[PDB]
């Protein structure tokens, strides 16, 4: 309700929200996932 | 480059990550098109790292996402889902 | 049937099932699977 | 337990489960899921 000033929608169609309605997802930027390669993918990026 | 080899290159790709998303009960997740009225330049650059390693040709690789301003949280993406 | 007996309750419960209502499932306890690592991962397992 | 190699810092890596008692069926876990 602070940083949505400027914008009167932004002020009203926040306020239809309850107090629980409105969630973070805190995603990690840091995967743990090993990138799956294949060298068709490999050099086919390459080449794109 | 990333792919040649030289690792230290974060590439910000411009406006991809939003922030302020409907998530209504119907099939589909709608961004707010009213919080992000630039309905293509209020999305988030996202800066993009590899992470090579050695076998502990290629190697043991990975991916990074950040933001343009991921300084006081670097890996922590927030979310602001408005759900019904 | 037998290896509930002392239970009341086990017996009651389980005789509410048909002969075709409980199925296992065998769980092999030697996945195939690569546990995907990365050394923020590797290290951040390790300090927590 | 855990399962180490080397090439053929870490190496590949895996996991493994067992239950106290896994020694006539050592990788197999039994279920008994009653379903409706």
Same mark, same amino acid.
């Given at each position: 309700?602070?940083?949505?000033?400027?914008?009167?929608?932004?002020?009203?169609?926040?306020?239809?929200?309850?107090?629980?309605?409105?969630?973070?997802?805190?995603?990690? +930027?840091?995967? +743990?996932?090993?990138?799956?390669?294949?060298?068709?993918?490999?050099?086919?990026?390459?080449?794109? | 480059?990333?792919?040649?080899?030289?690792?230290?290159?974060?590439?910000?790709?411009?406006?991809?990550?939003?922030?302020?998303?409907?998530?209504?009960?119907?099939?589909?997740?709608?961004?707010?098109?009213?919080?992000?009225?630039?309905?293509?330049?209020?999305?988030?650059?996202?800066?993009?790292? *590899?992470?090579?390693?050695?076998?502990?040709?290629?190697? *043991?690789?990975?991916?990074?996402?950040?933001?343009?301003?991921?300084?006081?949280?670097?890996?922590?993406?927030?979310?602001?889902?408005?759900?019904?």
């Amino acid at each position: 309700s602070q940083q949505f000033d400027p914008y009167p929608l932004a002020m009203q169609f926040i306020s239809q929200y309850s107090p629980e309605d409105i969630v973070t997802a805190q995603i990690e +930027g840091s995967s +743990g996932a090993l990138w799956r390669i294949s060298p068709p993918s490999r050099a086919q990026m390459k080449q794109e | 480059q990333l792919l040649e080899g030289r690792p230290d290159q974060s590439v910000v790709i411009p406006h991809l990550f939003p922030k302020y998303i409907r998530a209504p009960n119907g099939p589909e997740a709608n961004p707010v098109k009213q919080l992000q009225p630039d309905e293509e330049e209020d999305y988030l650059g996202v800066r993009i790292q *590899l992470r090579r390693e050695q076998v502990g040709s290629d190697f *043991l690789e990975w991916w990074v996402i950040e933001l343009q301003d991921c300084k006081a949280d670097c890996n922590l993406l927030p979310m602001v889902i408005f759900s019904d």
